[PDB]
């Protein structure tokens, strides 16, 4: 060997199976999934310069809102780095800070250590990381979990790698409190988005989730909705948006029981009607 | 089985049955038990609809006043949570911050655990649940039972059902601090009343689970005793409703002590009368 | 039984012979005395509505200075109560914030429980109980006394009753940081004693608790004294009393002792005389 | 017996030839020495009255600067209580705060109470006591000496005194913080010194205790000295006497190593002469 | 010996041999490379003077920027000091504060202890030192560490060596809060890089260690890039030039994958191209 | 005996052979030699008064800057004091507040008082003693040292002497802090030295200690630099002088390494020359 075909490793890998299914297991997010599209490239690349004689750095961040793909693009990243021979088992342990430190003085080093074992060879995916920094409580012992956090991304390295995520303005304030992670992190990945379209897009997944579709009259009703609930007071976005559903659930739920023709099907169960959203009183004015 | 017959689950499970009990064992409060009445709805349809293959999502808030059936109604859903075959044992375990949080360094986790077990396959309620969190204070550790709560809420569902109530001002703000709540209360139901007449009401009440009745003379003077006693200084609510109560209860237990016609039965002795009311210096100006 | 006698359970239970009792071993405060004579009644006729089919609830609290009868009050209350059959062993366990709480952590739990131990049966008198609660003092472990306190006072209702006892301003501010016992005391007693009058009446308490008379010459003495030291700076009521009253006994006791007419007796040694008084330089002008 | 006579008691107790004691082992301090002459008056007439059927209440403090005969004034209180039957071994324990509280956690309540074991039936004397409250700092179990000292002062009386002892505006701070101790204390003792006479008697008594004298002409360069000192900047009252004492003593010391006639005895080595004291710059003019 | 040839000492110890192995092994930074030929120099004569009858004083300071070459020093240092006689085995023990305090109350001072074991008879290298004083945090045992390693550094002198490192004004500070360390420290290095030239220099040195080199065009973009960057809001010099070069690899990578000539070599992926810098919004203005 | 001669004494002693020992080894500050000639002749006086029947009071303070002779007197005066009876084995034990204070919870009081066994017979020597007092910390465990030391200084006397040792602003804030120690102090001496002829003593003492002397023009050069230093932004005189040295002494190595003329001898390579003064930015202006 002394070249590299790119195309080669991108097919022999089965890299680009793991992006469709990140294409198809992703309500479309064309934003994050081309900058998946695009670390990927770089990924392989950098893999392709390794095997030509030039230990790699991995860990990412990943930063947004509840909603927005982390998760189900995590699992992908650890298939895709399984793929691409950075990563043994391409398996992803998913925790929050309250599987990392322990209430008891000195039972937080062991449990750390223990998931971190579990993580070894995959990917380490700590949740809103920032809770792990907490000088606001005292008897918390979460500094302990940063540094053998802290650690591991530089020391331990070829058997482990760690995705930070959350909201981006706690993450980045974690940095300054905590840093040596903003240059072991070589991966910033921003999870974007509400614009109307983003906001139904999430009702559309919210209700997708549960097992609700929409009559095309309710998909309106909805655009109505949500265009007159963000000009009204302690808009809170997509909490409107579940607490909406929510409501129309209720409303769905007692329009059935109360017509009540006979036996109904799944999809008279699934539907969310047009009287379900309308009878707000968002649509009175409160 | 293709389509589901509402009516016969519901006909089936007794859930009507409780819902009875509700309004018989709760002083109207309509407002309240058509919100019961309409979550039972929508409990009964998703479980339909978990019947023809589409884990629920359970946990819920309960938020208002001292005194609006938060507790009489908890126990209720238990019943109808049971009844709907989302709980095992259709039993509720109530609890203060006071059960899970223990003074020790580290004999809170045991302790809320075990509570947790009493729970088991029905419902745990925490009354005034914002009390976990306390930052204000040093040396309490009130903050792992929250993160073992958390954990229960979204790991360990299927055998147990959470309700934390109190005041909505201090609820809210536990949520601000303490997120990933929101989106593990399925149901927050208010619990409505103060109106002069909500201020009766609340009277009547109290006097029901004391076992005193008034005589309309006396309703009238209570009333009258009510608008006079919200214009003067320190006016706390129900508080000072219980109070006026109480040295009503005194003044009729010393009306009829000093009385004594003879032997009297228990109309004489569980009777408010006016002149129990009208005594007080409320009356007078102070 | 049909209707209920309620002197012949005035006069059976001796309910009457512990209020006469309470008359002969209290110097005179009948403003108190009348508060206890009515809580009698209530006491009585909830006791009779029991005996007719309609657990109590008992707990009380105490407030007003020192010396104004809320021991000896409280151990009729446990004699009164004991008579009424609302508790088995009619007696009094009188106790600080320093028998509840322990220093060490943890040996704070067994210490209030086994207190309360002796205390079942009857009546526990926590005096200025708002010391459980110091968040002022860390390494102090009174919360967990409080809670255990609290789960006490609903739970294990019908075989002890509590009395918190103390200055008023103090309770009430214990109650807005600890509420729930607000709901548990059914009996607010508050302790009158400052006016002229009452200060004097103050002197005259502290005096026959030492067993010391003034001479007539000397009352006037001291009701001259108080006008004046209430207009000289840091007047501070009580301890003022108390103070002056320290001096005139030595005063008195150098007064005897330079005398020495020869054998004095009783009245001689008790006697506060006018010289007693009249020797201090609040006559002088300062 | 019916009448008393105070003088049989007062000489058959041997209280006068304690009260002679003082006298003679406190360099001219009347105005203490009176207060004590008349407590003693007050002290024997309450315990004749003991003895014709009218537990006593004992504990005192005694306020005031360094160097005003605290100590030496408490050991001939304890002699003068043994002496008029009030305790048992008439014998002083004399303790400061770090005799009392330990620094481990657990390691003060042992401590507190065998400190009292060896205090019982005599007098305990708790220098400066208002360092047993720091809630300054953290880790200090100084608290719960003072709820076993507070308890012990109220409940087990008859077999202990207890003399807080300390700077007046210290102790009154000290009884602000922990009331109880005010209505504990049955005998305020003022310490009273400061005036050119004071300063001059203090510089005696220094040099007594070291034996050294001065001869009158150094006497008179000291009065001089003095009066020049209090209106030179940082006046420290009795440390600027010590402090000029020391220098003296460096003077004299060094006077007598140069002159070196041959041997010198006792007095030449005793004696601080004029030359000594007028060498100052308090002289030159700082 | 009564003279001493230094050129001998210098020759014979092979410390030129080090200072060669330095050029060669840090990317051309003069500056230090010279201050560390002088220190060798010094080094090297208080060396002879200690071989004519004339303990050293050793440690020393390395201030400075990430990148910088502290650590590359470093390790050349405990080289020389070696090849000087001044260090027995010539190895350098690189550690961080998470390698010396324990979270364990107690278990900081035998790691401390251990490490230091490890580090005898050569150079221990504490990065960011001033990580030890954490007074922010409480359970975090860091004094102790400093206790132990101030101890060693002017106690057990002639086994070791200590070099600790960062950013000069977390340095600085950290010697005012812990006095006695600047005094310890003989040698004082300062690690200079920010001017455009700077940045650049920096650029060069992140894409040397990545193995990533410019082409002549994209080296100009870059200066362009840097002189822009500069004047937009939150330019955080070295991590904007990460950043900058993150996102350029990012691009480089994309602009291969899609080109796809066919095979490609080393050149072609280690090559950061105009393309990749100039397609930057930093450019367009943002 | 019935007189003592003072000079038998004080040359049968040994005490002048430590005094002279003294003047040998001191670089000249008459002004302190003379104070402890002085404090000689009182200890020496004191010792023949304690030999004709009239415990001594033994304990001092050493204030002054660094470099003023604090620690070589203080050994000096282990010896004298050995030298005059007052102390058993004349051995000074030297020890910072972190030889006394330990980090854990209790692992101070054992560590203070074998601390303290090292110390017995002779003097222990706490350099900036103020130290203990911490709390500006918490979890610094500092005032048990406290304790244990003042307890020690008034009654285990005759078998201790305790230097503290400090900058004197620091050590008098240390007493207002801690009172009790002024009494124990009985020896309160001042190190004076900055003018710059101070300075350059200074300079003149740290090139002794070193074994580096300077030539006649070096010295004017180092006068020059001085007073040119003191007038340039952050002059932290004894510092600025160690760091002036410092880089004197580098450049007269890289001076001498060029130079090369052949073998170089002890005065070649001990002494800096005007060059290596000169040299310095401070005389280009910065
Ligand atoms: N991009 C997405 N495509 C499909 N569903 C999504 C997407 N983003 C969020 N969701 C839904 O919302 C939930 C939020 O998931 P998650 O990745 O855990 O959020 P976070 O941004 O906090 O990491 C998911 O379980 C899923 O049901
Ligand atoms: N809605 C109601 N209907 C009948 N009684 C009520 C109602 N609300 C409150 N009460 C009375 O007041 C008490 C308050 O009960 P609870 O449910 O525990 O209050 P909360 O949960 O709001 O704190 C009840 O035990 C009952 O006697
Ligand atoms: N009402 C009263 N009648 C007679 N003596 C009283 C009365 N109140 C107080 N005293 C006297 O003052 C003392 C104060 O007693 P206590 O009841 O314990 O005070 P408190 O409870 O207010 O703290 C009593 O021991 C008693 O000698
Ligand atoms: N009234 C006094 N008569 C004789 N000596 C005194 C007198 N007051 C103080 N001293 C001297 O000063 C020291 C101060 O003693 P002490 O009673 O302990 O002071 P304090 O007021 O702090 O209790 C004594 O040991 C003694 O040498
Ligand atoms: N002077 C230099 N010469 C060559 N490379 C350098 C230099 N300084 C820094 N680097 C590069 O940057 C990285 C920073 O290394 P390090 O010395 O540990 O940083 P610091 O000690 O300042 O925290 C090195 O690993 C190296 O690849
Ligand atoms: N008076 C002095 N005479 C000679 N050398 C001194 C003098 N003062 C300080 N030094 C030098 O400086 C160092 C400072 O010593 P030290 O007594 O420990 O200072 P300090 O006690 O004031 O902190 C000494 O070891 C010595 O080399
Ligand atoms: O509180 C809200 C909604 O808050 P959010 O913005 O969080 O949904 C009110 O608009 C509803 O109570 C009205 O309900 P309905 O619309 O059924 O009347
Ligand atoms: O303190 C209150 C009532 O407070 P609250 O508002 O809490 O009831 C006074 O009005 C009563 O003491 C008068 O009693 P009466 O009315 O019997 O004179
Ligand atoms: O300090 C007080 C009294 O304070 P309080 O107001 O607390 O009593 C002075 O008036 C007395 O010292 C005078 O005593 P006499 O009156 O014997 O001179
Ligand atoms: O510091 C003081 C005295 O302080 P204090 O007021 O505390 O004594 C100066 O007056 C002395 O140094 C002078 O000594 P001398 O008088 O021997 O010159
Ligand atoms: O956030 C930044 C850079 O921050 P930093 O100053 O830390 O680099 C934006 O300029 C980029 O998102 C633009 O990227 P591009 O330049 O590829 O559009
Ligand atoms: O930082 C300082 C000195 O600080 P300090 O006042 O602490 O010495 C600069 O003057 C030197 O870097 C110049 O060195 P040179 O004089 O060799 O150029």
């Known amino acids: 060997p002394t070249s590299?075909?790119?195309?080669?490793?991108?097919?022999?890998s089965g890299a680009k199976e793991v992006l469709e299914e990140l294409d198809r297991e992703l309500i479309g997010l064309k934003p994050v999934k081309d900058?998946?599209?695009e670390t990927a490239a770089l990924l392989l690349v950098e893999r392709a310069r390794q095997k030509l004689g030039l230990?790699?750095?991995?860990?990412?961040?990943?930063?947004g809102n509840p909603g927005t793909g982390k998760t189900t693009v995590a699992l992908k990243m650890a298939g895709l780095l399984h793929r691409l021979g950075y990563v043994r088992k391409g398996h992803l342990v998913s925790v929050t800070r309250d599987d990392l430190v322990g209430q008891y003085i000195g039972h937080t080093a062991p449990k750390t250590k223990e998931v971190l074992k579990r993580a070894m060879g995959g990917v380490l995916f700590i949740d809103e990381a920032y809770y792990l920094y907490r000088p606001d409580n005292e008897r918390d012992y979460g500094q302990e979990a940063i540094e053998i956090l802290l650690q591991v991304m530089?020391?331990?390295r070829d058997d482990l790698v760690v995705i930070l995520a959350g909201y981006a303005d706690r993450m980045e304030n974690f940095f300054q409190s905590n840093?040596?992670?903003?240059?072991?992190?070589?991966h910033h990945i921003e999870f974007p988005d509400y614009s109307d379209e983003e906001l139904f897009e999430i009702a559309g997944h919210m209700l997708d989730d549960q097992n609700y579709q929409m009559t095309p009259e309710a998909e309106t009703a909805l655009r109505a909705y949500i265009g007159l609930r963000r000009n009204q007071p302690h808009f809170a976005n997509a909490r409107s948006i579940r607490n909406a559903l929510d409501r129309a659930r209720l409303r769905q739920a007692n329009?059935?029981?109360?017509?009540?023709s006979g036996p109904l099907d799944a999809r008279a169960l699934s539907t969310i009607a047009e009287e379900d959203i309308r009878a707000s009183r968002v649509f009175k004015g409160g």
Chains 1, 2, 3, 4, 5, 6 share one sequence.
């Open 4 to 12: 590299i075909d790119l195309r080669a490793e991108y097919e022999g």
């Open 35 to 37: 900058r998946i599209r």
């Open 55 to 63: 230990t790699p750095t991995l860990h990412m961040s990943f930063t």
């Open 154 to 156: 530089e020391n331990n």
């Open 179 to 186: 840093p040596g992670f903003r240059s072991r992190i070589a």
């Open 255 to 260: 329009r059935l029981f109360t017509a009540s």
